[PDB]
Structure 1
């Protein structure tokens, strides 16, 4: 509606019998391949990402927001749990670190 791409803002400019809108849009580029899974199975319970996707780079699993590559360690802060890990299809296995354990306060 306001230009091709994810819309950020627009500036108007007068013309003799109409208007000229200068739409400013954000467009992604330089994409890359990754392997992913819908959930992680740890301790018999399934973990899902709060926001983003589980992205694997060949050997390690990470969480990353969907629209821009910024990998993070999978922790209890960015995932939520739901039931045992046998109903979801394509679940994979990996360690879900809890930041409270290493501190051991």
Structure 2
């Protein structure tokens, strides 16, 4: 997660850097906050 790691600069310099997900856990929360908001707009389409 972004909490198990820290950040600096870009992939040119770090010899043997590897590609992966870093899975920021704020976002699989706030996506599920937007999908709940989208349910509120879909409910607001009904009246």
Give the TM-score, by structure 2 length. 0.61
Structure 1 runs of 4+ aligned residues shifted over 3 Å read none
CA apart distance, 1:92: 0.5
State the Cα RMSD in Å. Answer: 0.9
Runs of 5+ in structure 1 lacking a partner?
Answer: 1-74
User: Whose strand fraction is larger, Structure 1's or Structure 2's?
Assistant: 1
Give 1:76 shift: 0.1
Q: Distance in 1 between matches of 2:28 and 2:18?
A: 24
What's the TM-score once normalised by structure 1's chain length?
Answer: 0.28
Q: Which has the higher contact order (CA 8 A, sep 6+)?
A: 2
Aligned to 1:101: 27
Greater per-residue helix proportion: 2
**Deviation string for 1:57-101 (max 9, x for gaps)?**
xxxxxxxxxxxxxxxxxx100100010111010000001100000
* Count of residues in Structure 1 that have an aligned counterpart in Structure 2: 31
